[PDB]
Design a protein around this motif. Structure first.
Motif, short mmCIF file in Angstrom:
data_model
loop_
_atom_site.label_atom_id
_atom_site.label_comp_id
_atom_site.label_asym_id
_atom_site.label_seq_id
_atom_site.Cartn_x
_atom_site.Cartn_y
_atom_site.Cartn_z
N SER A 250 0.84 -1.17 0.00
CA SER A 250 0.00 0.00 0.00
C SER A 250 0.88 1.23 0.00
O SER A 250 1.87 1.31 0.74
N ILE A 251 0.55 2.20 -0.85
CA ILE A 251 1.23 3.48 -0.81
C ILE A 251 0.32 4.49 -0.12
O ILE A 251 -0.76 4.82 -0.61
N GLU A 252 0.75 4.95 1.05
CA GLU A 252 -0.13 5.66 1.97
C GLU A 252 0.11 7.15 1.90
O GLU A 252 -0.77 7.94 1.56
N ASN A 253 1.33 7.53 2.24
CA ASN A 253 1.77 8.92 2.23
C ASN A 253 2.83 9.08 1.14
O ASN A 253 3.50 8.11 0.77
N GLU A 254 2.96 10.29 0.61
CA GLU A 254 3.94 10.57 -0.44
C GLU A 254 5.38 10.25 0.01
O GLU A 254 6.26 10.05 -0.82
N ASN A 255 5.60 10.27 1.32
CA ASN A 255 6.87 9.85 1.91
C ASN A 255 6.91 8.44 2.52
O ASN A 255 7.92 8.04 3.10
N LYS A 256 5.81 7.68 2.43
CA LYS A 256 5.76 6.38 3.10
C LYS A 256 4.99 5.27 2.37
O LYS A 256 3.87 5.48 1.90
N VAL A 257 5.60 4.08 2.28
CA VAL A 257 4.90 2.89 1.77
C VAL A 257 4.90 1.75 2.79
O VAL A 257 5.90 1.50 3.47
N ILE A 258 3.78 1.05 2.87
CA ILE A 258 3.66 -0.05 3.82
C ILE A 258 3.48 -1.38 3.10
O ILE A 258 2.66 -1.51 2.19
N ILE A 259 4.26 -2.37 3.51
CA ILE A 259 4.23 -3.68 2.89
C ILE A 259 3.69 -4.70 3.89
O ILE A 259 4.36 -5.03 4.87
N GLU A 260 2.48 -5.18 3.64
CA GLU A 260 1.79 -6.03 4.61
C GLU A 260 2.01 -7.52 4.37
O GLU A 260 1.77 -8.02 3.28
N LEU A 261 2.46 -8.21 5.41
CA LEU A 261 2.68 -9.65 5.38
C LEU A 261 1.91 -10.27 6.55
O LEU A 261 1.52 -9.55 7.48
N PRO A 262 1.66 -11.59 6.52
CA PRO A 262 0.77 -12.14 7.56
C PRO A 262 1.24 -11.95 9.01
O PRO A 262 0.42 -11.53 9.82
N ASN A 263 2.49 -12.26 9.33
CA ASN A 263 3.01 -12.03 10.68
C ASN A 263 3.88 -10.79 10.88
O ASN A 263 4.44 -10.59 11.95
N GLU A 264 4.02 -9.98 9.84
CA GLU A 264 4.88 -8.80 9.91
C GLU A 264 4.38 -7.73 8.96
O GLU A 264 3.61 -8.01 8.06
N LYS A 265 4.83 -6.50 9.17
CA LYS A 265 4.59 -5.47 8.17
C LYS A 265 5.83 -4.61 8.10
O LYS A 265 6.59 -4.54 9.06
N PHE A 266 6.07 -3.99 6.94
CA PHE A 266 7.24 -3.15 6.74
C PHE A 266 6.81 -1.74 6.39
O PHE A 266 5.87 -1.54 5.62
N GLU A 267 7.49 -0.77 6.96
CA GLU A 267 7.29 0.61 6.57
C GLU A 267 8.60 1.13 6.02
O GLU A 267 9.65 0.89 6.60
N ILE A 268 8.54 1.77 4.86
CA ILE A 268 9.69 2.46 4.30
C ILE A 268 9.28 3.92 4.24
O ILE A 268 8.33 4.27 3.54
N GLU A 269 9.99 4.76 5.00
CA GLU A 269 9.61 6.16 5.14
C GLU A 269 10.78 7.06 4.82
O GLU A 269 11.88 6.82 5.30
N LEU A 270 10.54 8.09 4.03
CA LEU A 270 11.54 9.13 3.80
C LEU A 270 11.22 10.29 4.72
O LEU A 270 10.20 10.95 4.55
N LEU A 271 12.10 10.54 5.69
CA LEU A 271 11.77 11.48 6.76
C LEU A 271 12.96 12.32 7.22
O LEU A 271 14.11 11.91 7.06
N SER A 272 12.69 13.49 7.79
CA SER A 272 13.77 14.36 8.24
C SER A 272 14.17 13.99 9.66
O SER A 272 13.53 13.14 10.29
N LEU A 273 15.21 14.64 10.17
CA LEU A 273 15.78 14.29 11.48
C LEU A 273 15.00 14.87 12.67
O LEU A 273 15.30 14.55 13.82
N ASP A 274 14.02 15.73 12.40
CA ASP A 274 13.23 16.32 13.47
C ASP A 274 12.18 15.34 14.04
O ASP A 274 12.04 15.20 15.27
#
Lengths: 20, 232, 99, 264, 88, 178
Positions: free
Chosen positions: D214-238
């Motif tokens: 799923s592509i949720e936010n312009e800076n974030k995608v979530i990859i859903e698996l049965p026992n786990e999920k992954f988030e890949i986020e492009l984010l600043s240091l604040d």
């Protein structure tokens, strides 16, 4: 105190006809 | 195929500067390459009329066979262990696949902005039988070996299919290879065109390259007669 | 580097010019002194004024030569990688695997 | 105030204007007496209208020049005035020398920090220098480059783990984010690179919408698996110690970058 | 194009020196006020010439300024550890 | 393609009719004083003295540089240099004829300013001589009425000896001291 190689055509001609 | 081109030249000493310039202008460093060409002509012992089955005049022409060779066949022992890069040029059963070409004398026209040459080509992939050597095959077509030359150089891939070759040419004979380009490099810029538009567009690309090198190295249209392989 | 040397030379030239200006000032004021009848500064007036011209002449010789060197260096020392990224990441990866 | 100073300047210059012009008009009429012939045409229209033709006169004298030659004091006055002017000029020149000297200090400091400014790769263009990092940005005085916290973002991947309540996940792992002229190029290259990485990933994910991606936010995608999920986020240091999946999050991260390199 | 810079610079130098010496001659020697104005003019021109030299220098400065198995083994580990497929 | 004039003529087949030209004011058939405007009205001949010619050409070559920058949208010694700048901008560059004409005009012009030229124009036009003569009087500086009536024989008796000396006096004064 102060002061004021070769001829392009000929090379090509060889590759196309063999003449030196 | 229509090959539009422009030629130029530089002496051995102009090498590094030219390579540096073409590298910045094109964005890529040079690529080493070679090719062996063997030219064949109609057998003089045989003689045929020079006309069609329709009784139309046909002009006798030379056939050019060309292929590559592994670089290792061009590096002796003195040449051994020398960066196999652009700088190397300074220190100078069945048949194999070949490119078979017959070309026409460039298009006529005063004040041509580029040379334009038609080229008929086919590819030889292999052979078999009694006389399978490319030589026999050429004889079977009624042709004989005339002369052959080796060309070694570097090329640059540029935009819109423009290619630039910096070359050195050596004729090959048992009596010895003589460097036709002795002194420097033959510079060639060209584009191969399989509609009037793409032809005028290609001319423009070549013209912009000529324009971009004006002042430094000049590219011009060679004499038609110097690009005519007809036998006579 | 070579370019650094060139820039350093140019900066030196700038310094020289500045000196020339300063001694122009000195020359002016002390000429003002000489006209008033103070001759004691005649040695110092002329010195600063002559040292000015000498410094300016030296700068002219240095600057003109530097411009010539620039023209001669055209095409020679002067204009007319993702494999690096990969090595960074592999380094990074083997480091994660073997901390 | 600067503007007020400009007003003063304009005032003075205007006074000069009036004076010289007046002189010219007077001359014009006096000439309109004889020649002229076309000389009277240089008189203002109001003045021309106001005065009838044929104005003034002249008389003959020698010896005003001889009287002037007799009195030599004016020359002395001239010499003195010249001397004074020379003095003022001297002071001013000293000032200029100092100012330009300090200016040369700062400018050659800039040039020396710029000899220190190190490389020949990157394109520099110009009254101030700007580099093309990709848009372009400006070099100014330590040293820094000004672009158009606004956007400086890296990407980290976190891993979530599903549990026995079966309703929701929780966070089991996270990738770490680590902290002259070439060094500013280095950071700028690592910046563009990761922004590219998120861009392409987002494009690829369009295909994967059916596969739990799923592509949720312009800076974030979530990859859903049965026992786990992954988030890949492009984010600043604040925005936003070890744990179980930190190692795996770091591996997926390095692998991601490596995949882009192969694409290159 | 650099030859033009050389020419302009040389002309500027000659102009600067000449104007300096000639101004030095002009004073010592409302006429006096006019002479003072002329002096101001010459000096100002000289300063402008200095700035010109600065421009030239800046121009010059700007001209100057403007394996496999290792990988296969490493990925083999990476992929293994990342799936956690072992699970035994 | 041979550039034509503003007036008509009957082709009597006898080409043998053309007379010579002199200082009896017998200029061409082309340059006689009763000539015709592009709009068709009969106006008088326009001969310019230098200074006056130097300005016409300069004023015109500038009007032209303007128009070329519009379409781009979509001290005597110093003047000799500026003029050669204006030419390389507005003229065809192959125009050696004009290039000399400006060097000539710039070096031989008696009056620099449009005001001064106008002053000459005013002065010389009460005399009602040929437009050719007033041009010469504006170009050739003369001191005596004889000098004038020798270098311009076309006068002789058109103007008096003393009235012409008055004029040479006023011309000499209007002369620009470069």
């Amino acid at each position: 105190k102060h002061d004021f190689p070769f001829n392009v055509d000929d090379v090509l001609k060889f590759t196309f006809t063999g003449e030196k | 195929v229509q090959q539009l081109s422009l030629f130029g030249s530089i002496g051995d000493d102009g090498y590094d500067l030219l390579i540096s310039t073409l590298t910045t202008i094109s964005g890529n460093p040079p690529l080493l390459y070679n090719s062996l060409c063997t030219v064949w002509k109609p057998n003089p012992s045989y003689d045929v009329e020079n006309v069609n089955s329709r009784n139309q005049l046909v002009e006798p022409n030379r056939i050019k066979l060309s292929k590559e060779v592994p670089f290792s066949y061009l590096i002796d022992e003195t040449m051994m262990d020398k960066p196999l890069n652009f700088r190397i040029l300074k220190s100078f059963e069945s048949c194999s696949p070949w490119s078979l070409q017959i070309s026409d004398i460039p298009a006529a026209g005063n004040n041509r902005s580029v040379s334009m040459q038609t080229i008929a080509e086919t590819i030889i992939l292999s052979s078999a039988g009694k006389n399978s050597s490319v030589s026999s095959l050429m004889n079977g077509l009624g042709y004989v070996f005339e002369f052959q030359y080796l060309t070694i150089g570097v090329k640059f891939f540029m935009k819109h299919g423009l290619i630039l070759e910096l070359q050195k040419i050596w004729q090959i004979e048992e009596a010895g290879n003589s460097q036709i380009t002795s002194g420097g490099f033959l510079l060639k810029a060209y584009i191969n065109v399989s509609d009037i538009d793409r032809i005028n567009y290609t001319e423009t690309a070549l013209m912009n390259l000529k324009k971009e090198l004006q002042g430094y190295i000049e590219l011009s249209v060679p004499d038609r007669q110097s690009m005519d392989s007809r036998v006579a | 580097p070579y370019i650094q040397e060139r820039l350093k030379s140019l900066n030196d030239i700038e310094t020289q010019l500045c000196s020339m200006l300063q001694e122009a000032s000195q020359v002016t004021f002390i000429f003002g002194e000489l006209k008033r009848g103070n001759e004691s500064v005649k040695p110092q007036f002329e010195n600063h004024v002559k040292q000015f011209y000498e410094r300016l002449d030296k700068s002219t010789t240095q600057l003109r030569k530097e411009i010539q060197l620039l023209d001669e260096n055209v095409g020679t020392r002067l204009l007319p990688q993702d494999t690096e990224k990969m090595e960074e990441q592999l380094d990074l990866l083997s480091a994660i695997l073997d901390p | 105030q600067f503007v007020k100073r400009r007003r003063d300047m304009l005032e003075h210059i205007n006074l000069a204007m009036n004076e010289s012009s007046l002189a010219l008009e007077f001359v014009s009429l006096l000439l309109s007496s004889v020649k002229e012939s076309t000389g009277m045409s240089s008189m203002s229209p109001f003045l021309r209208k106001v005065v009838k033709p044929s104005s003034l006169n002249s008389d003959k004298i020698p010896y005003v020049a001889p009287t002037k030659k007799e009195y030599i004091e004016l020359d002395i006055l001239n010499k003195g005035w010249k001397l004074q002017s020379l003095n003022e000029s001297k002071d001013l020149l000293r000032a200029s020398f100092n100012k330009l000297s300090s200016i040369l200090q700062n400018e050659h400091d800039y040039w020396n920090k710029i000899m220190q400014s190190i490389s020949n790769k990157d394109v520099i263009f110009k009254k101030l220098l700007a580099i093309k990092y990709g848009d372009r940005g400006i070099a100014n005085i330590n040293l820094d480059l000004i672009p158009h916290h606004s956007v400086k973002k890296f990407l980290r991947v976190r891993i979530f783990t599903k549990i026995e309540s079966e309703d929701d996940y929780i966070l089991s792992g996270e990738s770490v984010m680590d902290r002259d002229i070439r060094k500013q190029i280095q950071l700028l290259k690592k910046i563009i690179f990761e922004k590219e990485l998120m861009y392409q990933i987002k494009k690829e994910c369009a295909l994967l919408i059916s596969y739990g991606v799923s592509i949720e936010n312009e800076n974030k995608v979530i990859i859903e698996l049965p026992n786990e999920k992954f988030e890949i986020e492009l984010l600043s240091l604040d925005d936003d110690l070890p744990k179980i999946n930190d190692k795996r999050a770091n591996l997926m991260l390095v692998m991601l970058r490596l995949l882009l390199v192969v694409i290159f | 194009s650099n030859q033009a810079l050389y020419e302009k610079l040389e002309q500027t130098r000659t102009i600067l020196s000449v104007k300096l010496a000639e101004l030095i001659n002009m004073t010592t020697i409302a006429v006096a006020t006019t002479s003072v104005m002329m002096v101001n003019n010459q000096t100002m021109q000289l300063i402008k010439n200095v700035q010109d030299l600065l421009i030239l220098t800046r121009s010059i400065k700007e001209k100057w300024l403007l394996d496999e198995k290792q990988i296969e083994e490493l990925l083999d580990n990476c992929i293994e550890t990342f799936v956690a497929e072992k699970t035994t | 393609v041979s550039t034509s004039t503003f007036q008509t003529r009957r082709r009597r087949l006898k080409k043998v009719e053309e007379e010579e030209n002199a200082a009896t004011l017998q200029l061409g058939q082309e340059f006689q004083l009763k000539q015709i405007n592009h709009q068709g009205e009969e106006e008088e001949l326009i001969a310019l003295n230098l200074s006056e010619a130097r300005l016409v050409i300069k004023e015109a070559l500038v009007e032209r540089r303007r128009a070329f920058k519009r379409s781009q949208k979509k001290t005597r010694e110093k003047e000799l240099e500026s003029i050669d700048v204006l030419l390389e901008q507005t003229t065809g560059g192959n125009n050696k004829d004009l290039k000399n004409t400006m060097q000539y005009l710039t070096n031989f012009s008696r009056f620099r300013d449009q005001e001064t030229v106008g002053a000459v124009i005013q002065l010389l036009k009460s005399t009602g001589l040929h437009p050719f003569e007033v041009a010469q009087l504006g170009s050739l500086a003369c001191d005596t009425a004889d000098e004038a009536k020798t270098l311009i024989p076309s006068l002789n008796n058109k103007i008096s000896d003393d009235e012409l000396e008055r004029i040479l006096k006023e011309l000499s004064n209007l002369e620009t001291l470069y």
